[PDB]
Amino acid sequence: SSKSVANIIRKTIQREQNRIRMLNQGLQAVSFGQVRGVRLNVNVRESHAI
Amino acid sequence: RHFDVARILVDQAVRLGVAEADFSGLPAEWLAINDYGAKVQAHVIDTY
Amino acid sequence: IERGKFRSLTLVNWNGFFARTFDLDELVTTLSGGNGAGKSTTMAAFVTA
Numbered sequence: 001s002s003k004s005v006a007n008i009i010r011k012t013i014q015r016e017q018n019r020i021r022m023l024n025q026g027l028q029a030v031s032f033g034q035v036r037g038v039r040l041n042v043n044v045r046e047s048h049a050i
Numbered sequence: 051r052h053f054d055v056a057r058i059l060v061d062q063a064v065r066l067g068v069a070e071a072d073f074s075g076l077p078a079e080w081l082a083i084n085d086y087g088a089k090v091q092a093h094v095i096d097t098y
Numbered sequence: 099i100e101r102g103k104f105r106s107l108t109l110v111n112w113n114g115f116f117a118r119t120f121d122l123d124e125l126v127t128t129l130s131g132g133n134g135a136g137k138s139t140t141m142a143a144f145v146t147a
């Protein structure tokens with residue numbers, strides 16, 4: 001059961017990472033002050049990967 | 051109208067290069083630019 | 099009588115300000131500039147001093 005759990009979490013995390021990474025390209029370098037672009041960083045947490 | 055001119059002119063001038071003296075540590079003086087007591091503080095704009 | 103006055107504010111080697119002195123007015127000083135110009139930085143200078 002624990003193995004199946006870990007597997008389903010890994011698959012869901014990968015799917016969500018892919019979705020968000022595809023979505024990130026929906027931004028076109030907004031110009032606000034010295035901010036030239038906005039982006040979303042999605043990364044699996046090593047503290048949780050272990 | 052003088053004020054409404056000064057501002058605008060400065061807005062137009064500061065987009066054109068920088069002033070090299072601003073890194074010298076020597077403050078600029080308040081040069082009078084008219085009667086009635088109007089003054090301006092800016093180094094010469096050299097590096098375009 | 100004759101209230102003391104802050105005459106000047108100096109910033110040295112700060113982000114955007116290597117060496118900048120502002121001559122504080124006796125009544126009103128108004129910083130003006132676009133977003134990110136660094137006005138909050140100047141008031142930060144005053145307070146931290």
Ligand SMILES: Nc1ncnc2c1ncn2[C@@H]1O[C@H](COP(=O)(O)OP(=O)(O)OP(=O)(O)O)[C@@H](O)[C@H]1O
Pocket residue numbers: 033034113131132133134135136137138139140
């Ligand atoms: N601690 C900091 N670390 C990194 N960058 C900073 C820091 N503080 C300010 N900045 C940057 O310095 C620039 C000036 O910031 P600041 O907030 O002083 O601007 P401002 O013109 O006073 O802002 P506003 O008019 O919107 O109140 C901006 O690019 C800001 O991102």
Ligand SMILES: [Mg+2]
Pocket residue numbers: 134136137138139
């Ligand atoms: Mg600010």
